[PDB]
């Protein structure tokens, strides 16, 4: 439980750091890192106590860990310029992290509801809109 929480928080931090160093598609990569850092903030607060998670909370945390591992795999893949160029030429909307953003948003909704109801923690609605704007800003930076 404590080890699981530390692993997820470390994943989020490595994803943010890797997104910050990305040389291409900076708006989309920076948005992914910023969103991940914001999602792990209440998990950092829960970790700062040292309570026991229910099995429903453990299930939701493990699903969130799986979405973060997928995001880390995508950032690692896109650290190679050729993989970015290949993916974007094949993509329809030019949104680099479309699939993993959907998974992060869906798994986060279940997890935050359990943190609020079970651990008394005090949403990805604008995300698809922000994704299209960041993708356009990135496409424009590339087209100069
Ligand atoms: C390859 N093809 C790209 C890009 C890119 O960043 N963007 C935003 C695109 O729209 N396309 C089609 N890359 C990545 O490499 C950028 C050029 O580096 C020299």
Numbering used by the authors: 0 to 49, 52 to 123, 129 to 150
Quoted passage from the original study:
MLKL is a key player in the necroptosis pathway, encompassing a C-terminal regulatory and an N-terminal executioner domain. Currently, two classes of compounds are reported to inhibit MLKL by covalently binding to Cys86 in the short α-helix 4 located on top of the four-helix bundle, which comprises α-helices 1, 2, 3, and 5.
The binding pose of Cpd 3 was very similar in the NMR and the X-ray structures of the MLKL:Cpd 3 complex. Overall structural changes upon complex formation were minor, and the overall fold of MLKL was preserved. This resulted in a stacking interaction with the aromatic ring of the xanthine core, therefore creating an additional contact between α-helix 6 and the four-helix bundle. Here, we report that the xanthine class of inhibitors acts by stabilizing the packing of α-helix 6 against the four-helix bundle through the formation of a stabilizing π–π-stacking interaction between Phe148 located in α-helix 6 and the xanthine core. Mutation of Phe148 to alanine leads to loss of the stabilization of the auto-inhibited state of MLKL by xanthine class compounds, confirming the key role of the observed π–π-stacking interaction for the activity of the xanthine class.
